[PDB]
Design a protein around this nucleic acid. Sequence first.
DNA 1: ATATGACGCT
DNA 2: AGCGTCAT
Length: 431
Amino acid sequence: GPHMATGQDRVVALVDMDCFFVQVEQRQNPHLRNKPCAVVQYKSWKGGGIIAVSYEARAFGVTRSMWADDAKKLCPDLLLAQVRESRGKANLTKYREASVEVMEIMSRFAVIERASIDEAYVDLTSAVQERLQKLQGQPISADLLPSTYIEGLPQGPTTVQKEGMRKQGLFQWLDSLQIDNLTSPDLQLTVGAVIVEEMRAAIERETGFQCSAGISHNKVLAKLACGLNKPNRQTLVSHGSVPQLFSQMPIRKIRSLGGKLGASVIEILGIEYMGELTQFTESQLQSHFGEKNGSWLYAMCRGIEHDPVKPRQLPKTIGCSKNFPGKTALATREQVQWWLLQLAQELEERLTKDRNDNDRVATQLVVSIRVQGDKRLSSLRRCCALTRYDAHKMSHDAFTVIKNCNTSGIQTEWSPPLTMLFLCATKFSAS
DNA sequence: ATATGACGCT
DNA sequence: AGCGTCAT
Ligand SMILES: Nc1ncnc2c1ncn2[C@H]1C[C@H](O)[C@@H](COP(=O)(O)NP(=O)(O)OP(=O)(O)O)O1
Ligand SMILES: [Mg+2]
Ligand SMILES: [Mg+2]
């Protein structure tokens, strides 16, 4: 009772850009704004695979991973923008640079952890306290949170509109706030949400990009909260909202549970929602899923998670990959050498950029391949030393460490055909 | 036939 | 080290 830890010791946020690749193209081309539009790679095969969808196009049913020709059937007025192609492969330089614009603005407010190209976690714990002493006891007006939803609110007896429902929840939340108390976790989330409103106001104002965000006590709840009110809104998930939120929250919606372990949690325990995990003791969950998973599950279903926000705005690896599906699979020794050079050339261009910008050198190269028929994403991984940022040496050394896999007695041929080539620069050191 | 990045297990 | 899982 008096000695229970509720996991209310941190204020963690997850900011995620709304249809990021689309917004990047819409800022560059005004004709694409406020219209159903999507981003595609490789216009040849069925018009190109869609990798980002605007919300105007999502209303028609256009989704990611869909072929552009199929998406034109659902949305005939759909506009398209192609990803730049360099050396025969997709080139995402325009979006990595747009990412750095946002990451540097978020870095001004608090420590962030780059989670993807369009999202980063934030640890607002140190920023919330210093803001609390600056507001010497004065309350928080709703004008400081013009786009914040309070998950679970409004409730009970006192509108039909979406935005009307938002403020009544914020009103109930603010009216019950304990500003008398600086050790109140619910007050810390509110100050954290005020800061995120300022961060997101700075992002849109200095880049033109809109984003959603989640504010809670850990990374998992923040990411879940971020998806509740997209687009362009932030959601506060408090500790008290967890039981009702998790009572019907599918297990797959929780981070790290959308894969196989989440499936076995559903099958073995025979449950549907995240809240049903509270019935089980920790030893039971440890016996079914291991000591790490059982401990993590037992605390997560109660809204408690301890994975810290690592101060890391830079990637740990720099890699280049390209798939060769179907009959396009590389089957000649000349093809494999040529594409390894194309990958190594772009890799050098990115590594030299990384060494001048970020003062570090990659020290080893990882070569990954997939053969025709193998189900796993990777079929084989071999590694060597990355001494020079030389595209011809890297591609040559990459070929040296994979030429054994060629089960073809012929010199000029390559069997089995290669489905994917992948070079990855890892193991950085200060330069 | 939809290019990447972080991390755990052994 | 090499493979597997999870994610955008
Ligand atoms: N499977 C994939 N293939 C290629 N590119 C992808 C991808 N997933 C993401 N991207 C690229 C394209 C995306 O623009 C960006 C982030 O994708 P999200 O954050 O998962 N979803 P979005 O930001 O598009 O909209 P919203 O967050 O409101 O749902 O990374
Ligand atoms: Mg996004
Ligand atoms: Mg995202």
